[model samples]
Target chain A: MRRYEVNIVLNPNLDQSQLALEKEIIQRALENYGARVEKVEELGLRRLAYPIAKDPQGYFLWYQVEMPEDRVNDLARELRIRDNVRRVMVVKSQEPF
Target chain B: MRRYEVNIVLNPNLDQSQLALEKEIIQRALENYGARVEKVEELGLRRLAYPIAKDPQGYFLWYQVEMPEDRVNDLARELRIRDNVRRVMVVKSQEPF
Candidate 1:
């Protein structure tokens, strides 16, 4: 398993319940793919450096996980289909774990 | 009112109480200056692009507020005096409100 950090930006329009469910779904997806979540951080609504999807702001959430190399594509596919996710990026760490 | 975003990096070594206190102090500083907090986001600990103060990560936070034009200096001064705040950047909105 390789260490990876995923940063996702959710639609700012989502209410509390929707946001919670989206988080659960993402977490479930990672777990199903044999990823072990090391940390989950919530970055509340923030102004974007550049406008995205016509939005000036977005709610940011970040996850640090360890998973098999092959499962990265699977995770990205899952997030891509979610309407609430505006942006997603997978950052691979350079430092040795 | 001029819109502004303040991105602050808090010391990762702080416990809950210390973190809360620091947050309160920053919030209070804005409130005292008639700044209305449009949004306050808690972006938990994150990997820094570059290390600061010997730490590889920091707790990220962003606040969007509307305040008088001159109050920007006052706000910056307050944040500069904080021990827990490792970095802060004030971005003034360019778009018309």
Candidate 2:
């Protein structure tokens, strides 16, 4: 298994319930793709450097996982289609430090 | 005091000693500006979305700090002048969470 980090920006307009649901969906997607989550870092809502989808703020969440490379693309695709996700980025770890 | 998150990207070419020194410099800079660090997370090295200095990778570091609003500019200026720093961003926390 290779380590990868996924940084996600959720729409700030989401209420508490919606935010909780979004987090659940993200975890479910990772598990579905056979990824084992190592850590989840919640950075909270922050002002964006630039507007994305006309929104100035986004809730930032970072996930560290270990999974096969093939599963990464699958996870990215799922996140891209989620309306609540403003941006998603997946970066593979170069080595275990 | 306001909470702020600072994300820094260090040059990929830095050796172990250089990386250690750079981290120390950053911490000192924050302390010099009266920022109290809540957490310091080392995300390790990861591939960059876009190359910043002809390198495709960078070392990622995140700092959550509570500081007076006036001190942010001083911290940013110090980071901007550091040779090993590729990118630095400061985002204020909207509320206590």
Candidate 3:
């Protein structure tokens, strides 16, 4: 397995239950790709550096994951297409984990 | 205009001429969106923390720009669809530019 960090910017307008659902769907997608999600970091809602899709703020989530190298792109592609996700990025992590 | 940074990961397989052309296209795209590119930092070719699209290394470039807030997403979207680019990210810069 290879280590990666996934950063996602979520819609700032989501209510608690809606936010939870979005989080759950993302976790399930990661797991479906056989990824071991190590840590979840909530960066919380903050003003965006600039507006995205007309929203001036975003809720951020960071995921530390270990997964097969072959499945990385597929997972990133899946995450990008979600309606509730404003931005998603997957980068190889240089950690000794 | 708002300050922002754009980081792009290019295919490691590009040669000098290809790299030049790619860079030019990106710069033009930014200018076309009326962005003032403040600095262009060449991060150079480095081994990937992990493979991306089967490549074990990538050439990285960073652009510091100031542009209208409304055009930020459009510029980012244009950069993402380029075949030579593996990853592109735009984030608001907190610098007092």
Candidate 4:
């Protein structure tokens, strides 16, 4: 498995439970694809460098995991469809476990 | 303690030792500030959206920690002066343990 990390931005107005649900659903998707789930960082709301989706603030979430070479696009494709998730980025980890 | 995360971009040419040292110094400084080191992400080299320092690529390092209400500036100040780091971003984390 290769290490990968994704930084996503969510709409800031959602309450705690909604955010938690969003994280759970995304995590579940990764696990379903046989991705070894690792750390998930909740970087709370912050003003954007510029507005996104007509909102000036966003909640940032960063996820770290390991996935086989072939399954990434499947996971990313699923994540892009989540309504609460504004932006997603997935990249390989450069270091050891 | 308030959580914080830092994303740093370093010159890609420096070997792993220098990269290791930079992370060590930054981590140690954060520890000295009564911060709890949480996670470190070494995102391997990648081509930049645009060139930085005339190089076309950079090494990405992401640090997650919990810092006391103060002393954050001290950590940022130390990181900014490091020789190889091309960019540093320190932001408050919006989540819990």
Candidate 5:
């Protein structure tokens, strides 16, 4: 299994409670794919240097997970269509030290 | 020119002088490709979740530049081959706010 780091930027329009749910939904989606979630790094809300869809701010969250390489693209496409997800960057994480 | 944000993690072992030169080499490379640098964000040293080349910590730097879309691949390839560069993630900055 390859480890992938997924960085997501959520739309700041989400309320505090909705924010949790949004993250959960994405987590559940990844879980369904048999990915072992390793770490979740919450960077919190930050102002974007440039606006995406006119959104000036985004709540950043980083997730480190191990899963099949073939499934990476599938997960990316899934998140791309999700509402309130501003930015998504997925890259292969380094192997264990 | 398309705006790109590059997040680079440099080897923490680099001395202060070498670090500055590394950043300059990257900047000069991009500039040659007609990139207009917008901002250079130095996130400083950060602990890595997993060791990269036995490196437990990395000096983080974010660069915002506007350059030709066609030149993106060339720049990425250059950084990938650098010995002291650990991780590089490049994404398009949000369009004008």
Candidate 6:
């Protein structure tokens, strides 16, 4: 398995409770694909350097995960199309986090 | 130019003074190649999941940079060979950080 830092941006409009729910949902999604989440860092809201789809801000989260490299792309695509998921990026972390 | 997050692990044995010096040297290295560092996030020291070259801990730093994608690999190689740089990873950040 390869280690990765999956950084995601959620819809800025999400309320505090909504944010918590999405976090659980996303974590479960990662597990469903055999990915082990080693860590989660909530970066809170950050204003975009440039607006995307009129979103001036986004809630960021980082999940340090271990999974097969091939399945990484599949997870990224799945999250990208999900409601309230603004952006998804799977960055390889060769060294364990 | 493409945006990237250059995550690096530094030698754990270095003193605070030495750590600061390396940061300056690295930022200059990035600038030398026409890479503009947009932000610097110091993750501080973290114990490794497994030892690397007898080092059990590493200091992590994240440099949000903008530069031509082709030059990224060159920079990664350059940093990897530096005395105190343990590991270097260039992760593409498509939507600005």
| Candidate closest to the true structure, highest lDDT | 3
Which is the winner by TM-score between candidate 2 and candidate 6?
6
Model 6, A1-97: lDDT tens digits are 8889999999988888998999888988899778988888888777776777798888899988889888888888878877899888888775454
TM-score of chain A of 2: 0.91
Q: Interface RMSD of every candidate?
A: 8.0, 7.7, 2.4, 9.7, 9.5, 5.0
DockQ of 5: 0.04
Query: A29-86 in candidate 1: lDDT tens per residue?
Result: 8899889998887878776767888998888898888999898988888987898988
Runs with alpha carbons beyond 4 Å of true place in candidate 2: A94-97, B1-97
Q: What is the lDDT of candidate 5?
A: 0.80
DockQ versus reference, model 2: 0.12
Score each candidate by Cα lDDT. 0.84, 0.86, 0.88, 0.79, 0.80, 0.85
Task: Estimate, for each residue in B1-97, the C-alpha lDDT of model 6 and write its tens digit.
Answer: 9889899999988898999999988988899777988888898777776777799889899988999888888889888888899888888875455
What is the docking quality class of candidate 4? incorrect
Task: Tell me the docking grade of candidate 5.
Answer: incorrect
- Candidate 6: TM-score, chain B only: 0.91
Cα distance off (Å), candidate 1, residue B24: 4.1
Question: iRMS of candidate 4, one decimal?
Answer: 9.7
What's the true lDDT of residue A42 in model 5? 86
Off by over 4 Å in 6: A1-9, A14-40, A44-57, A63-97
Clashes of each: 0, 0, 0, 1, 0, 0
Local accuracy of candidate 5 as per-residue lDDT tens digits, A1-97: 7788988999877888898998888999899776899999889889764566666688899999998766765676588688788777777786632
Question: Clash pairs of candidate 6?
Answer: none
Q: On a 0 to 100 scale, what is the lDDT of residue B64 in model 2? A: 87
Q: Model 1 off-target regions past 4 Å?
A: A1-25, A32-34, A41-62, A68-74, A82-97, B13-21, B32-34, B41-51, B55-61, B68-74, B91-97
The DockQ ranking, best first, is 3, 6, 2, 1, 4, 5
User: What TM value does the first chain of each candidate achieve?
Assistant: 0.90, 0.91, 0.91, 0.88, 0.90, 0.91
- Listed in order, each prediction's TM-score against the native is 0.58, 0.56, 0.86, 0.52, 0.52, 0.59
